[PDB]
Amino acid sequence: ELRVGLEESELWLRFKELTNEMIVTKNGRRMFPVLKVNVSGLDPNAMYSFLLDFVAADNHRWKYVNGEWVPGGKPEPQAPSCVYIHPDSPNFGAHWMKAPVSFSKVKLTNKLNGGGQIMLNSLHKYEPRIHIVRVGGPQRMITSHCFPETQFIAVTAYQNEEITALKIKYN
Ligand SMILES: NC(=S)Nc1ccccc1OC(F)(F)F
Numbered sequence: 334e335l336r337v338g339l340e341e342s343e344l345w346l347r348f349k350e351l352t353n354e355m356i357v358t359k360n361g362r363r364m365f366p367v368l369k370v371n372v373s374g375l376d377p378n379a380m381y382s383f384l385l386d387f388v389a390a391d392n393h394r395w396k397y398v399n400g401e402w403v404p405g406g407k408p409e410p411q412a413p414s415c416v417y418i419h420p421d422s423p424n425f426g427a428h429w430m431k432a433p434v435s436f437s438k439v440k441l442t443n444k445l446n447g448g449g450q451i452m453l454n455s456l457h458k459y460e461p462r463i464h465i466v467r468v469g470g471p472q473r474m475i476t477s478h479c480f481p482e483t484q485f486i487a488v489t490a491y492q493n494e495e496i497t498a499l500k501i502k503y504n
Pocket residue numbers: 416
């Protein structure tokens with residue numbers, strides 16, 4: 334059975350208990366913490382691509398009101414995010430299983446862009462999700478996994494200074 338684990342879940346949970354925030358810029362900003370996934374149970378000899386996307390966790394615009402994030406009462410259906418391909422893709426199962434798969438180079442933006450960068454809507458809440466795509470073989474297959482621990486709100490600047498301090502402390 335294909336097993337997918339989050340690496341450093343301890344640390345993600347410290348961000349989640351404050352409500353995590355990720356900066357978006359026009360040029361794109363790398364994530365901290367980095368999503369790192371432990372994968373076992375692949376066919377070491379089969380070929381896979383690792384894809385990352387961001388599900389809109391709800392339809393609401395969020396605002397930091399007097400020290401607390403609060404959703405609005407004007408939600409709308411959210412266009413789904415673009416998919417980032419892990420730059421090691423495509424690769425053998427053995428490649429993916431020898432170390433945590435680290436999405437260190439994805440950049441989060443707020444603007445339609447040259448490509449690579451993933452566009453999010455500022456002040457929306459997102460749940461990172463991966464797709465493991467068995468490629469090249471006769472039988473294509475997809476295993477998907479969500480990481481609730483890694484939920485965040487996309488922001489143009491940090492609102493909660495406890496997040497700012499945690500980001501620096503652990504970077
Ligand atoms: N989920 C997506 S958008 N996958 C994808 C991305 C880039 C090229 C091809 C892709 O899918 C295909 F291989 F199944 F066609």
